[PDB]
Tab-separated table of C-alpha atoms and ligand atoms in Angstrom:
chain	number	residue	atom	x	y	z
R	1	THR	CA	-19.376	-45.310	0.465
R	2	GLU	CA	-16.420	-42.967	0.301
R	3	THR	CA	-16.489	-40.527	-2.613
R	4	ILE	CA	-12.845	-39.746	-3.306
R	5	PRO	CA	-10.965	-38.248	-6.246
R	6	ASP	CA	-8.885	-40.767	-8.117
R	7	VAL	CA	-5.230	-41.302	-7.371
R	8	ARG	CA	-4.056	-39.427	-10.481
R	9	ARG	CA	-5.999	-36.327	-9.464
R	10	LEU	CA	-4.862	-36.387	-5.813
R	11	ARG	CA	-1.229	-36.940	-6.810
R	12	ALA	CA	-1.342	-34.271	-9.559
R	13	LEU	CA	-2.653	-31.675	-7.106
R	14	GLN	CA	-0.117	-32.657	-4.441
R	15	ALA	CA	2.730	-32.310	-6.989
R	16	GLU	CA	1.552	-28.908	-8.151
R	17	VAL	CA	1.279	-27.704	-4.558
R	18	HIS	CA	4.774	-28.983	-3.726
R	19	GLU	CA	6.182	-27.274	-6.842
R	20	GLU	CA	4.487	-23.993	-5.950
R	21	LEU	CA	5.886	-24.119	-2.442
R	22	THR	CA	9.484	-25.053	-3.243
R	23	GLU	CA	10.018	-23.477	-6.647
R	24	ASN	CA	8.060	-20.263	-6.176
R	25	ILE	CA	7.222	-19.342	-2.563
R	26	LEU	CA	10.217	-20.551	-0.551
R	27	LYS	CA	12.566	-19.760	-3.413
R	28	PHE	CA	11.435	-16.150	-3.387
R	29	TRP	CA	11.825	-15.836	0.372
R	30	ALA	CA	15.255	-17.489	0.552
R	31	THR	CA	16.717	-15.480	-2.352
R	32	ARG	CA	15.066	-12.068	-2.254
R	33	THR	CA	14.547	-11.254	1.423
R	34	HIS	CA	17.716	-12.094	3.390
R	35	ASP	CA	19.567	-8.896	4.406
R	36	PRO	CA	23.357	-9.113	4.636
R	37	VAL	CA	23.653	-5.531	5.956
R	38	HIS	CA	21.659	-5.765	9.211
R	39	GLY	CA	21.324	-9.535	9.229
R	40	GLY	CA	17.929	-11.239	9.280
R	41	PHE	CA	15.350	-10.289	6.642
R	42	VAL	CA	14.129	-7.086	4.968
R	43	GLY	CA	10.931	-5.545	6.341
R	44	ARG	CA	9.533	-4.672	2.929
R	45	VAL	CA	9.772	-5.611	-0.749
R	46	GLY	CA	8.090	-3.224	-3.192
R	47	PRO	CA	5.728	-4.068	-6.089
R	48	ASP	CA	8.678	-4.019	-8.504
R	49	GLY	CA	10.547	-6.546	-6.363
R	50	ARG	CA	12.938	-4.013	-4.746
R	51	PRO	CA	14.024	-5.131	-1.269
R	52	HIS	CA	14.213	-2.425	1.402
R	53	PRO	CA	16.870	-3.383	3.975
R	54	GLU	CA	16.478	-0.050	5.793
R	55	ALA	CA	12.689	-0.314	6.307
R	56	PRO	CA	11.195	-0.886	9.786
R	57	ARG	CA	10.788	-4.582	10.570
R	58	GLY	CA	7.752	-6.144	12.248
R	59	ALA	CA	7.746	-8.888	14.834
R	60	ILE	CA	4.813	-10.648	13.194
R	61	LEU	CA	6.583	-10.753	9.832
R	62	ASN	CA	9.791	-12.054	11.340
R	63	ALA	CA	8.040	-14.688	13.423
R	64	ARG	CA	6.192	-15.743	10.276
R	65	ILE	CA	9.476	-16.177	8.431
R	66	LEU	CA	10.829	-18.238	11.328
R	67	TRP	CA	7.694	-20.394	11.503
R	68	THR	CA	7.537	-21.057	7.760
R	69	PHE	CA	11.156	-22.088	7.277
R	70	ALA	CA	11.076	-24.150	10.501
R	71	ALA	CA	7.923	-25.945	9.354
R	72	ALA	CA	9.282	-26.468	5.848
R	73	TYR	CA	12.534	-27.837	7.244
R	74	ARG	CA	10.688	-30.202	9.581
R	75	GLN	CA	8.442	-31.612	6.863
R	76	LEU	CA	10.737	-31.474	3.815
R	77	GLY	CA	14.236	-31.643	5.286
R	78	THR	CA	15.903	-29.273	2.789
R	79	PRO	CA	19.019	-27.843	4.490
R	80	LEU	CA	18.433	-24.339	3.045
R	81	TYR	CA	15.200	-24.133	5.055
R	82	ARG	CA	16.997	-24.798	8.341
R	83	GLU	CA	19.629	-22.201	7.399
R	84	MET	CA	16.901	-19.620	6.696
R	85	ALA	CA	15.045	-20.449	9.904
R	86	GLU	CA	18.277	-20.175	11.891
R	87	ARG	CA	18.866	-16.736	10.325
R	88	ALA	CA	15.359	-15.618	11.328
R	89	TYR	CA	15.751	-17.055	14.849
R	90	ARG	CA	19.070	-15.366	15.598
R	91	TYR	CA	17.809	-11.904	14.571
R	92	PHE	CA	14.550	-12.514	16.431
R	93	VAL	CA	16.155	-13.304	19.792
R	94	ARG	CA	18.716	-10.528	19.374
R	95	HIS	CA	16.342	-7.686	18.577
R	96	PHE	CA	12.640	-8.538	18.920
R	97	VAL	CA	12.913	-10.224	22.334
R	98	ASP	CA	12.780	-7.802	25.249
R	99	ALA	CA	15.386	-9.303	27.544
R	100	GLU	CA	14.241	-7.017	30.378
R	101	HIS	CA	10.435	-7.092	30.480
R	102	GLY	CA	9.923	-10.207	28.367
R	103	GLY	CA	7.936	-10.824	25.176
R	104	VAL	CA	8.549	-9.228	21.777
R	105	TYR	CA	8.540	-5.614	20.552
R	106	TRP	CA	6.034	-4.638	17.814
R	107	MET	CA	8.579	-3.100	15.421
R	108	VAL	CA	12.329	-2.567	15.376
R	109	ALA	CA	14.448	-0.396	13.106
R	110	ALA	CA	16.390	-2.344	10.483
R	111	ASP	CA	19.506	-2.312	12.660
R	112	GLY	CA	17.585	-3.861	15.532
R	113	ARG	CA	16.867	-0.836	17.717
R	114	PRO	CA	13.390	-0.919	19.289
R	115	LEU	CA	11.097	1.407	17.339
R	116	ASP	CA	7.633	0.519	18.654
R	117	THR	CA	7.889	-1.251	21.976
R	118	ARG	CA	4.239	-2.070	22.590
R	119	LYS	CA	3.565	-5.674	23.548
R	120	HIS	CA	0.626	-6.764	21.377
R	121	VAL	CA	-0.844	-10.204	22.141
R	122	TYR	CA	-1.155	-10.873	18.382
R	123	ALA	CA	2.618	-10.501	18.105
R	124	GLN	CA	3.248	-12.434	21.343
R	125	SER	CA	1.152	-15.233	19.877
R	126	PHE	CA	3.138	-15.376	16.637
R	127	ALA	CA	6.328	-15.469	18.736
R	128	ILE	CA	5.014	-18.484	20.659
R	129	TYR	CA	3.851	-20.162	17.416
R	130	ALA	CA	7.216	-19.682	15.657
R	131	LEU	CA	9.458	-20.542	18.626
R	132	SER	CA	7.474	-23.716	19.319
R	133	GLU	CA	7.801	-24.779	15.658
R	134	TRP	CA	11.522	-24.065	15.675
R	135	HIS	CA	11.764	-26.280	18.778
R	136	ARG	CA	9.752	-28.983	17.028
R	137	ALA	CA	12.190	-28.745	14.091
R	138	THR	CA	15.525	-28.686	15.943
R	139	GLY	CA	15.069	-29.459	19.632
R	140	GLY	CA	16.424	-26.070	20.699
R	141	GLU	CA	15.850	-25.632	24.432
R	142	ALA	CA	16.239	-21.853	24.466
R	143	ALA	CA	13.457	-21.505	21.898
R	144	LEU	CA	11.035	-23.519	24.015
R	145	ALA	CA	11.974	-21.721	27.242
R	146	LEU	CA	11.337	-18.399	25.508
R	147	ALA	CA	7.964	-19.535	24.193
R	148	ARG	CA	7.017	-20.610	27.719
R	149	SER	CA	8.108	-17.250	29.154
R	150	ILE	CA	5.912	-15.379	26.685
R	151	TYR	CA	2.955	-17.657	27.478
R	152	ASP	CA	3.363	-16.758	31.160
R	153	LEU	CA	3.432	-13.025	30.392
R	154	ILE	CA	0.189	-13.203	28.367
R	155	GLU	CA	-1.592	-15.015	31.188
R	156	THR	CA	-0.159	-12.703	33.866
R	157	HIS	CA	-0.747	-9.322	32.250
R	158	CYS	CA	-3.532	-9.878	29.723
R	159	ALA	CA	-5.979	-12.635	30.714
R	160	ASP	CA	-9.458	-11.367	31.562
R	161	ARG	CA	-10.432	-13.769	34.314
R	162	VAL	CA	-13.925	-12.241	34.747
R	163	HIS	CA	-15.079	-12.544	31.137
R	164	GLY	CA	-12.783	-15.004	29.333
R	165	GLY	CA	-10.169	-14.224	26.705
R	166	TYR	CA	-7.508	-11.528	26.762
R	167	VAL	CA	-6.765	-7.831	26.817
R	168	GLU	CA	-4.945	-7.524	23.488
R	169	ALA	CA	-2.228	-4.902	23.900
R	170	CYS	CA	0.146	-3.588	26.576
R	171	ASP	CA	3.036	-1.163	26.556
R	172	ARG	CA	6.667	-2.260	26.852
R	173	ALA	CA	6.390	-2.956	30.589
R	174	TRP	CA	3.044	-4.751	30.215
R	175	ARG	CA	0.807	-1.879	31.286
R	176	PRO	CA	-2.265	-2.310	29.113
R	177	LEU	CA	-3.160	0.117	26.292
R	178	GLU	CA	-6.431	1.823	25.430
R	179	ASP	CA	-5.758	1.356	21.725
R	180	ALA	CA	-5.381	-2.357	20.887
R	181	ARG	CA	-5.935	-1.876	17.155
R	182	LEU	CA	-3.583	-3.837	14.927
R	183	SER	CA	-4.109	-1.261	12.170
R	184	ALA	CA	-6.345	1.662	11.176
R	185	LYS	CA	-8.846	-0.752	9.582
R	186	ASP	CA	-9.720	-2.375	12.903
R	187	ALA	CA	-12.639	-1.343	15.124
R	188	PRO	CA	-11.507	0.497	18.292
R	189	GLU	CA	-12.926	-2.279	20.498
R	190	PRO	CA	-11.308	-4.128	23.408
R	191	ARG	CA	-11.745	-7.654	22.010
R	192	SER	CA	-11.160	-9.099	18.547
R	193	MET	CA	-11.731	-12.521	16.989
R	194	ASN	CA	-8.516	-11.959	15.032
R	195	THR	CA	-6.192	-11.734	18.040
R	196	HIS	CA	-7.975	-14.537	19.876
R	197	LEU	CA	-7.695	-16.863	16.841
R	198	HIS	CA	-3.938	-16.424	16.839
R	199	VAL	CA	-3.751	-17.001	20.586
R	200	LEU	CA	-5.540	-20.308	19.978
R	201	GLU	CA	-3.181	-21.127	17.118
R	202	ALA	CA	-0.026	-20.383	19.154
R	203	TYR	CA	-1.246	-22.204	22.256
R	204	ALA	CA	-2.045	-25.328	20.213
R	205	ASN	CA	1.472	-25.438	18.766
R	206	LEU	CA	3.012	-24.809	22.196
R	207	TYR	CA	0.935	-27.608	23.692
R	208	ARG	CA	2.352	-29.996	21.059
R	209	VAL	CA	5.858	-29.598	22.475
R	210	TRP	CA	4.956	-28.753	26.070
R	211	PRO	CA	1.754	-30.457	27.247
R	212	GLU	CA	1.346	-28.502	30.503
R	213	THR	CA	-1.881	-29.009	32.456
R	214	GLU	CA	-2.721	-25.336	32.910
R	215	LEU	CA	-1.978	-24.699	29.207
R	216	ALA	CA	-4.488	-27.412	28.262
R	217	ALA	CA	-7.089	-25.630	30.404
R	218	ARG	CA	-6.315	-22.271	28.818
R	219	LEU	CA	-6.484	-23.751	25.310
R	220	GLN	CA	-9.775	-25.473	26.118
R	221	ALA	CA	-11.168	-22.208	27.531
R	222	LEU	CA	-10.316	-20.530	24.209
R	223	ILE	CA	-12.019	-23.254	22.166
R	224	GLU	CA	-15.080	-22.900	24.401
R	225	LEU	CA	-14.990	-19.102	24.020
R	226	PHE	CA	-15.045	-19.456	20.224
R	227	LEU	CA	-18.066	-21.790	20.362
R	228	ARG	CA	-19.952	-19.651	22.882
R	229	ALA	CA	-19.216	-16.065	21.901
R	230	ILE	CA	-17.421	-15.756	18.565
R	231	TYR	CA	-18.962	-18.305	16.203
R	232	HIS	CA	-22.536	-17.304	15.301
R	233	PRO	CA	-24.741	-20.350	14.574
R	234	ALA	CA	-27.465	-18.237	12.902
R	235	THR	CA	-25.108	-17.000	10.163
R	236	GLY	CA	-22.163	-19.399	10.032
R	237	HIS	CA	-19.763	-16.483	10.423
R	238	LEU	CA	-17.396	-15.289	13.122
R	239	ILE	CA	-18.238	-11.995	14.806
R	240	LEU	CA	-15.145	-9.792	14.535
R	241	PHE	CA	-15.130	-7.352	17.489
R	242	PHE	CA	-16.617	-7.259	20.983
R	243	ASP	CA	-16.623	-5.437	24.261
R	244	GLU	CA	-15.051	-7.002	27.336
R	245	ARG	CA	-18.133	-9.149	28.048
R	246	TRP	CA	-18.176	-10.470	24.478
R	247	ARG	CA	-21.134	-8.358	23.444
R	248	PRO	CA	-20.862	-7.979	19.642
R	249	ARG	CA	-19.574	-4.612	18.409
R	250	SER	CA	-19.274	-5.476	14.718
R	251	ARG	CA	-21.373	-6.815	11.851
R	252	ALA	CA	-18.549	-7.298	9.330
R	253	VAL	CA	-17.911	-10.730	7.848
R	254	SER	CA	-14.420	-11.963	6.958
R	255	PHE	CA	-14.539	-15.041	4.713
R	256	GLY	CA	-10.802	-15.655	5.106
R	257	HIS	CA	-10.992	-15.705	8.913
R	258	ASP	CA	-14.060	-17.994	8.811
R	259	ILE	CA	-12.364	-20.621	6.675
R	260	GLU	CA	-9.062	-20.355	8.612
R	261	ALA	CA	-10.870	-20.852	11.924
R	262	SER	CA	-12.788	-23.776	10.436
R	263	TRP	CA	-9.599	-25.806	10.370
R	264	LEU	CA	-7.593	-24.220	13.219
R	265	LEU	CA	-10.370	-24.924	15.769
R	266	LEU	CA	-10.221	-28.638	14.928
R	267	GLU	CA	-6.426	-28.581	14.963
R	268	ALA	CA	-6.609	-27.196	18.510
R	269	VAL	CA	-9.195	-29.672	19.804
R	270	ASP	CA	-7.200	-32.575	18.340
R	271	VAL	CA	-3.888	-31.416	19.847
R	272	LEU	CA	-5.690	-31.420	23.197
R	273	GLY	CA	-7.361	-34.740	22.436
R	274	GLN	CA	-10.611	-33.251	23.709
R	275	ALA	CA	-13.106	-35.889	22.516
R	276	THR	CA	-16.004	-34.339	24.477
R	277	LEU	CA	-15.719	-30.967	22.716
R	278	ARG	CA	-14.937	-32.304	19.231
R	279	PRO	CA	-18.473	-32.932	17.897
R	280	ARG	CA	-19.483	-29.301	18.583
R	281	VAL	CA	-16.252	-27.950	17.147
R	282	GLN	CA	-16.689	-30.130	14.060
R	283	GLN	CA	-20.256	-28.857	13.660
R	284	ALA	CA	-19.160	-25.228	13.862
R	285	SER	CA	-16.186	-25.962	11.605
R	286	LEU	CA	-18.318	-27.490	8.845
R	287	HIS	CA	-20.844	-24.663	9.105
R	288	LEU	CA	-18.107	-22.032	8.747
R	289	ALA	CA	-16.852	-23.907	5.691
R	290	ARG	CA	-20.331	-24.186	4.119
R	291	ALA	CA	-21.088	-20.517	4.773
R	292	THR	CA	-17.795	-19.624	3.067
R	293	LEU	CA	-18.722	-21.841	0.083
R	294	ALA	CA	-22.161	-20.303	-0.249
R	295	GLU	CA	-21.424	-16.652	0.418
R	296	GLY	CA	-17.745	-15.799	0.143
R	297	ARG	CA	-16.834	-17.110	-3.304
R	298	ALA	CA	-16.646	-15.605	-6.759
R	299	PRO	CA	-17.833	-17.790	-9.629
R	300	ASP	CA	-14.162	-18.795	-10.318
R	301	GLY	CA	-14.058	-20.216	-6.775
R	302	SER	CA	-11.697	-17.622	-5.287
R	303	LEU	CA	-12.648	-15.906	-2.028
R	304	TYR	CA	-13.845	-12.324	-1.711
R	305	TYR	CA	-12.293	-10.242	1.084
R	306	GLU	CA	-15.106	-9.168	3.387
R	307	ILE	CA	-18.549	-7.724	3.864
R	308	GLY	CA	-17.868	-4.506	5.699
R	309	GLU	CA	-19.619	-2.779	8.574
R	310	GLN	CA	-22.021	-1.025	6.202
R	311	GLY	CA	-22.676	-4.141	4.160
R	312	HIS	CA	-20.388	-3.551	1.199
R	313	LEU	CA	-18.870	-6.613	-0.426
R	314	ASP	CA	-15.135	-6.160	-1.013
R	315	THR	CA	-14.516	-8.336	-4.040
R	316	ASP	CA	-10.699	-8.022	-3.989
R	317	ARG	CA	-8.895	-11.366	-3.789
R	318	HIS	CA	-6.235	-11.027	-1.111
R	319	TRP	CA	-3.503	-13.657	-1.070
R	320	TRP	CA	-4.161	-15.165	2.355
R	321	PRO	CA	-7.884	-16.023	2.125
R	322	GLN	CA	-7.093	-18.112	-0.957
R	323	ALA	CA	-4.402	-19.972	0.998
R	324	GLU	CA	-6.715	-20.489	3.954
R	325	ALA	CA	-9.506	-21.730	1.648
R	326	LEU	CA	-7.195	-24.358	0.180
R	327	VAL	CA	-6.581	-25.782	3.658
R	328	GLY	CA	-10.084	-25.157	4.986
R	329	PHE	CA	-11.858	-26.770	2.045
R	330	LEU	CA	-9.516	-29.802	2.064
R	331	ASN	CA	-10.130	-30.068	5.802
R	332	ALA	CA	-13.890	-29.863	5.337
R	333	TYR	CA	-13.674	-32.688	2.822
R	334	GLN	CA	-11.625	-34.771	5.260
R	335	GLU	CA	-14.078	-34.154	8.100
R	336	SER	CA	-17.361	-34.602	6.228
R	337	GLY	CA	-16.460	-36.860	3.335
R	338	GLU	CA	-18.410	-34.507	1.059
R	339	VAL	CA	-16.513	-34.258	-2.191
R	340	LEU	CA	-18.037	-30.837	-2.996
R	341	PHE	CA	-15.406	-29.494	-0.577
R	342	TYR	CA	-12.616	-31.154	-2.532
R	343	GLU	CA	-14.022	-29.579	-5.711
R	344	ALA	CA	-13.942	-26.202	-3.985
R	345	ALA	CA	-10.316	-26.775	-2.912
R	346	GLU	CA	-9.451	-27.617	-6.516
R	347	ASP	CA	-11.167	-24.459	-7.767
R	348	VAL	CA	-9.325	-22.156	-5.400
R	349	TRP	CA	-6.040	-23.867	-6.288
R	350	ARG	CA	-6.697	-23.238	-9.967
R	351	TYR	CA	-7.385	-19.588	-9.134
R	352	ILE	CA	-4.159	-19.412	-7.149
R	353	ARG	CA	-2.210	-20.713	-10.130
R	354	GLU	CA	-3.962	-18.685	-12.796
R	355	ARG	CA	-4.495	-15.368	-10.998
R	356	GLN	CA	-3.004	-15.049	-7.510
R	357	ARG	CA	0.549	-16.224	-8.201
R	358	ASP	CA	2.871	-13.534	-9.636
R	359	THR	CA	4.735	-15.595	-12.229
R	360	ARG	CA	6.642	-12.436	-13.316
R	361	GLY	CA	8.057	-11.188	-10.066
R	362	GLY	CA	7.761	-14.334	-7.973
R	363	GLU	CA	5.638	-15.266	-4.954
R	364	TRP	CA	1.937	-14.269	-4.866
R	365	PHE	CA	0.252	-10.926	-5.487
R	366	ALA	CA	-1.116	-9.428	-2.266
R	367	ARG	CA	-4.353	-8.405	-4.024
R	368	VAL	CA	-6.081	-9.084	-7.315
R	369	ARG	CA	-9.093	-7.058	-8.461
R	370	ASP	CA	-12.447	-8.601	-9.483
R	371	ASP	CA	-11.552	-8.021	-13.165
R	372	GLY	CA	-8.290	-9.952	-12.789
R	373	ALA	CA	-5.973	-6.929	-12.542
R	374	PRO	CA	-3.240	-7.253	-9.910
R	375	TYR	CA	-2.871	-4.241	-7.642
R	376	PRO	CA	0.629	-2.696	-7.398
R	377	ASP	CA	0.913	-3.542	-3.692
R	378	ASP	CA	4.075	-4.445	-1.789
R	379	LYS	CA	5.243	-8.078	-2.205
R	380	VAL	CA	6.538	-8.229	1.368
R	381	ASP	CA	5.547	-5.930	4.215
R	382	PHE	CA	4.562	-5.816	7.898
R	383	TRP	CA	1.435	-7.837	7.138
R	384	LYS	CA	2.592	-10.042	4.258
R	385	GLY	CA	4.975	-12.879	5.186
R	386	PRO	CA	5.420	-16.453	3.881
R	387	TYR	CA	3.195	-18.049	6.502
R	388	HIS	CA	-0.342	-18.194	5.074
R	389	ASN	CA	0.696	-19.495	1.677
R	390	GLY	CA	3.649	-21.531	2.909
R	391	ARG	CA	1.545	-23.182	5.587
R	392	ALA	CA	-1.336	-23.730	3.143
R	393	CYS	CA	0.979	-25.648	0.808
R	394	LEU	CA	2.544	-27.720	3.591
R	395	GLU	CA	-0.922	-28.552	4.982
R	396	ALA	CA	-2.313	-29.508	1.563
R	397	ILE	CA	0.696	-31.750	0.853
R	398	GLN	CA	0.229	-33.709	4.095
R	399	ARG	CA	-3.581	-33.862	3.831
R	400	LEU	CA	-3.333	-35.142	0.255
R	401	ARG	CA	-0.770	-37.717	1.443
R	402	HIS	CA	-3.344	-38.942	3.940
R	403	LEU	CA	-6.132	-39.028	1.342
R	404	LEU	CA	-3.846	-41.013	-0.982
R	405	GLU	CA	-3.554	-43.645	1.765
R	406	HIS	CA	-7.284	-44.388	1.536
R	407	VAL	CA	-6.240	-46.801	-1.207
R	408	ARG	CA	-5.083	-49.526	1.206
R	409	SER	CA	-1.968	-51.636	0.630
R	410	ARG	CA	-2.357	-55.299	-0.344
X	1	LIG	O1	-6.352	-5.995	10.751
X	1	LIG	C1	-4.979	-5.790	10.628
X	1	LIG	C2	-4.303	-6.300	9.457
X	1	LIG	O2	-4.871	-7.630	9.075
X	1	LIG	C3	-4.197	-8.167	7.987
X	1	LIG	O3	-4.773	-9.361	7.592
X	1	LIG	C4	-4.406	-10.437	8.469
X	1	LIG	C5	-5.654	-10.986	9.091
X	1	LIG	O4	-6.182	-10.047	9.964
X	1	LIG	C6	-5.452	-12.268	9.799
X	1	LIG	O5	-4.785	-12.070	11.090
X	1	LIG	C7	-4.626	-13.225	9.049
X	1	LIG	O6	-4.382	-14.304	9.878
X	1	LIG	O7	-3.349	-12.591	8.596
X	1	LIG	C8	-3.680	-11.538	7.713
X	1	LIG	C9	-2.440	-11.019	6.985
X	1	LIG	O8	-1.402	-10.492	7.789
X	1	LIG	C10	-4.219	-7.179	6.792
X	1	LIG	O9	-3.475	-7.691	5.702
X	1	LIG	C11	-3.724	-5.841	7.163
X	1	LIG	O10	-3.952	-4.919	6.012
X	1	LIG	C12	-4.367	-5.317	8.317
X	1	LIG	O11	-5.732	-5.039	7.995
X	2	CL	CL1	1.794	-14.359	5.909
C-alpha cells in the first residue's frame, strides 16, 4: 500500500541533487572563499562575486563552513572536502575559540583579532554542531573536547533552571546581556525559537559522538520545551519570541523555521532513541509540514519568507527556506507515506534549479523576488554560509538512497 515514485524518478532527482552539491555549491565554496592572506575563509563575497578578505568574519559563518565540508567529507569522501574542513578548523580554533573564558567570539577581524567578543548561544551552538561533525568525520579528540567544553559553558552560564531553555547571550566572560538580538530584525525579547532550535540541533549532533546521560536529559528537555511552549497546535506554526516564562511575545510566522524544525525535531528524538516522545514529535512534525504546504508556498512551490508582526506576507524567496523545504518535505513523505509531500519536494527542487540557483555567478542567490528577479545581495556574508543548502543536498541524497531501497533485493 506504499505509494512511491518510480526508480527512474527517485534516481534522477538524487543525481541532480548530487550534481548541484558537488558541481555548484561545494565548488563555489572551495574555489572562491579560501583566503591565502589571513588563512581560513573570507567573511563576505559581494553580489558581483568579489571576495573580501579584509571583511569582519563571523563565528556562525565559519562554523557553518567547517560543518559543511566535514559532513561532505564524511558522506562523499572527496579529499578536497577534508582539506577545506581542516582549513576551517585550524582558523576556528586559532581565532574564534576564547582560550581564556571558553566558547567562541561573535566576530573577529580578518586577521583573527577579536572584534565582537560577546558569547551568543546561537554561535556556541554552531560551534558544538561543527566540532562534533568534524570529530565524526576524522576522530579528532581536540575537536570533541572543545565541543564538550562549550556545552558545559552553556549549561553553567545560560540555562534557565526555573523556566526551561536558555538565556541567549553573554559577554566575553559569560556575564549575560540585556540585548540577545541576533540582528536588528529580531524582537528584543529574552527567548527565541531560533536560538533554541539551534541548541537542539547542536546537542543532537554532540550526543551522536558523546552519549552522556546528562546531555540526553538536556536534549530531551529541549524537545519537550518545543512541544509544550514553542509549537502551536492551533496554527501549526512555531511561535518566534517569548519572555522568560515562555509567554508568547510575537505573532510572526516563519515558514522556513517551521519546515526546518519539522525534520530537526525528529532527528533529535531519534538520536536519543526516545520512543515514548516520538509519536507526539511526529504529530507536531507532520503538522508543521502540512501548515507549510498550505500556507507558506507560492504557486510554483517555493516558500515565502514570513508573515510579519503586523500580518504582512513577505513573498521574497530566501535561499535557506527552499533548502529546508527540500529536506522537510522529503522527511514528511518518509514519515507519513503521503506522496503529496514528495511532490512538494520535487516542486521546490525545480524552483531551486530554475530560480534560486545563480548559474551565472555560482552558488545560490540569497533572495529572489516574487516576479523572479534576483536581488543584488551578497553571495556570502555573516548570515549566508554553505550549511543550509549543503546540508539539504546531503540529506536529500541519503533520504533518496533509503527510498530507493524500498525496492527489495531478490
Ligand atoms: O534573525 C537573524 C538573522 O537570521 C537569518 O536567517 C537565519 C534564520 O534565522 C535561521 O537561524 C536559519 O537557521 O539560518 C538563517 C540564515 O543564516 C537572516 O538571514 C538574517 O538576515 C538575520 O535576520
Ligand atoms: Cl548557511
